[PDB]
Amino acid sequence: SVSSVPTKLEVVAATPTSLLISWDAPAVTVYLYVITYGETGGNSPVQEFEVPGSKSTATISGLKPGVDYTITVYASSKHSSRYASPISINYRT
Amino acid sequence: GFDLSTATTLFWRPVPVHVKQQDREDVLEELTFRILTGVAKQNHNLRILRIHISSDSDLFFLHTLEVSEEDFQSLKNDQGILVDFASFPGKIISLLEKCILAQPGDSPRFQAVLTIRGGESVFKIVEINDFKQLPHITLAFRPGN
């Protein structure tokens, strides 16, 4: 078959407080994307938002500058449940 | 009353729909569908399905459907459905996917239709063959949220 996970995840543009992430969509018709962001090795609980399945980019705002964040995109499809098929990257804002 | 805090989104994306209104021309437009499962504030034991139809272009175009487990039984008998309320959302999603994946030269062809006539609008997904428009799902939507 073909993979149900997003392929290439990178920070395309950035502000000291906000990030714009891009991914290459999986070949499967995606129902929704769930994005989780949190500080790498921080004490704070992870933040999560949802974006439509037609979208291949997302914006994370309210971030603290010069901090390492871990960003994960979860893609839901016919054969992928909500938090299956994850792609993660690390970025320093 | 739906508890949006305890609600889970299963499906949030545009779907191609043929929209028919009494005094306007038929339009093939991509409408954003959001499907949510959750419980009511009045009772965590009552499970509810929510479907919201919206347009990114028009802020006055809103249609909503809420189906309770009791309501599903009437829907199950009238439409010959063979699955439980738990599997009901996934089947609706698969039918919506077939409308999205439909190609121009398809026979039979899957098509989604929203018919707006006054206070109600009826949403249907049909398979069009040589004989008839055979109904896969027919749902009654109310204007608003």
Author numbering:
A (entry chain K): 0 to 92
B (entry chain A): 15 to 159
Text of the article:
Centriole biogenesis begins with self-assembly of SAS-6 proteins into 9-fold symmetrical ring polymers, which then stack into a cartwheel that scaffolds organelle formation. SAS-6 proteins contain an N-terminal globular head domain followed by a long coiled-coil, and a C-terminal region predicted to be unstructured. Moreover, SAS-6 homodimers can form higher order oligomers through a weaker interaction between two head domains from neighboring homodimers, with a ~40° angle between the two coiled-coil pairs. Here, we developed monobodies against Chlamydomonas reinhardtii SAS-6, characterizing three in detail with X-ray crystallography, atomic force microscopy and cryo-electron microscopy.
In order to identify the binding epitope of the three monobodies to their respective target, we determined their X-ray co-crystal structure. Similar to the crystal structure of CrSAS-6_N in its native form, the molecules are arranged in head-to-head dimers here as well, with small variations between them, likely due to crystal packing. The binding mode was identical to that in the co-crystal with CrSAS-6_N, with an overall RMSD of 0.855 Å.
